Design a protein around this ligand. Sequence first.
Ligand SMILES: [Mg+2]
Ligand SMILES: [Mg+2]
Ligand SMILES: [Mg+2]
Ligand SMILES: [Mg+2]
Lengths: 264, 262
Amino acid sequence: TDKTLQQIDKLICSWLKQIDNVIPQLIMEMTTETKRHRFDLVTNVDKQIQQQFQQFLATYFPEHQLLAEEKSNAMITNEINHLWIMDPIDGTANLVKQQEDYCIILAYFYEGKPMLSYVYDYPHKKLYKAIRGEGAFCNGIKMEEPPSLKLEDAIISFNAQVMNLDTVQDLFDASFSYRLVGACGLDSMRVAKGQFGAHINTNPKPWDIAAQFLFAELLNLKMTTLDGKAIDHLKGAPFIISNKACHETVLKILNANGGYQKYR
Amino acid sequence: KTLQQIDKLICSWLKQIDNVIPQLIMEMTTETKRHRFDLVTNVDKQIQQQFQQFLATYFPEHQLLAEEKSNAMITNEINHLWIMDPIDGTANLVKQQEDYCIILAYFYEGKPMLSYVYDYPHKKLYKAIRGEGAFCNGIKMEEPPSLKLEDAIISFNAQVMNLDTVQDLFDASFSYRLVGACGLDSMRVAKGQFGAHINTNPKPWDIAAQFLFAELLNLKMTTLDGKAIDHLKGAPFIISNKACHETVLKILNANGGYQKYR
Ligand SMILES: [Mg+2]
Ligand SMILES: [Mg+2]
Ligand SMILES: [Mg+2]
Ligand SMILES: [Mg+2]
């Protein structure tokens, strides 16, 4: 019967907050599998959260389609009216090794435009949300655009194991310091908060970055491919989320000297 | 008995500190010490002076070795010694207002007796009490499960080591993270979240609490040559799960070592 964004937001926040009741059990009985190789992990926590959201969607928004990490998405196209992108646990490695520093990522796109976004830092019970027209919130405290941050004054975050070492060194020298949380959504939220200058992921999936688009728009962040272009939310791309004042400097470092790949 | 009596007093000082810290941050002021990356705030200075007055008041004979103070004096052989990092992770305080802590450790005749790592932004107090155990907000911490390096996340500062040995560490461990406060990176080792934390040039206050936690939870805490660390002075150091300590040290010292060669 046609809902407002706030009615949809109310349903989602409510389903997210009631996953607090479900997760301690999943964790107590955690089981791990591998996908691409031995370190590419998936657990019963990832699988249950995803399938519960599937079931939520069947039951509230049955027209709506789901693009999500732990299933095939062959059926998802260019011309989808109502689309949810989900990472049921972003930072699975941190879930398994630490039970901390992981989140649930959700993002709703209406005829391809980001309308609702969610990053649930469950270990710390901090629900980041973005709502087109209302703004961005952490547990309902409203977020505002961070202070300008030049790279020399700012902490940066990226996976240093996946890049050419010279370019890792150049990023070290040009920033104030380096930090890594190890969940794309959480390291992104440190940028949104203004705690990090920038977060780079040179090969994310759609679900690792899906919520961040609307955060970047509402809080005046740069979120681009490492070529400085728009990212297709339906497909990967190498990406940066950054404060406005250090975006260009970071991209120029990444692309210098033949670029950031190990073989250049 | 006496450790619990002193412990109750530290715990309630640290409790009152929650009420002080918002005020200090309200009027936060920042300066640099050694260079542009070496920060000190009034949060650091005031937390320190207040512990100092606490000690003046209750334990006049006890000495204090603390970051924001000259520590000429101090010797050699002192009976009651406190080592204090008033804010460990000042860079995180200033840049992030998160992932910083207070480190306090009490040595009786040179032997660790009480130790505190207060993660003030999460209001989590890790404490250790000789004869009683280690605790997080009152719940007992247990020895963590064995972690071989290849199964362990490790934490260290990659910017102060040559990049060959950084790569060797990356290739040998499960993965790499950094919290960026010695106290908190160390607690993750104590909790079994990390296999090991390295700091290649810590001050005495950056690692002072950690001795007792390592002792009581069966961690290894040594110099990077595997020797005992003198708590009165820094040394390059590692705190480690007992099952990945040798492997880390071996990598760190292999191939002519971890220092920068350019
Ligand atoms: Mg995964
Ligand atoms: Mg995931
Ligand atoms: Mg300092
Ligand atoms: Mg300090």
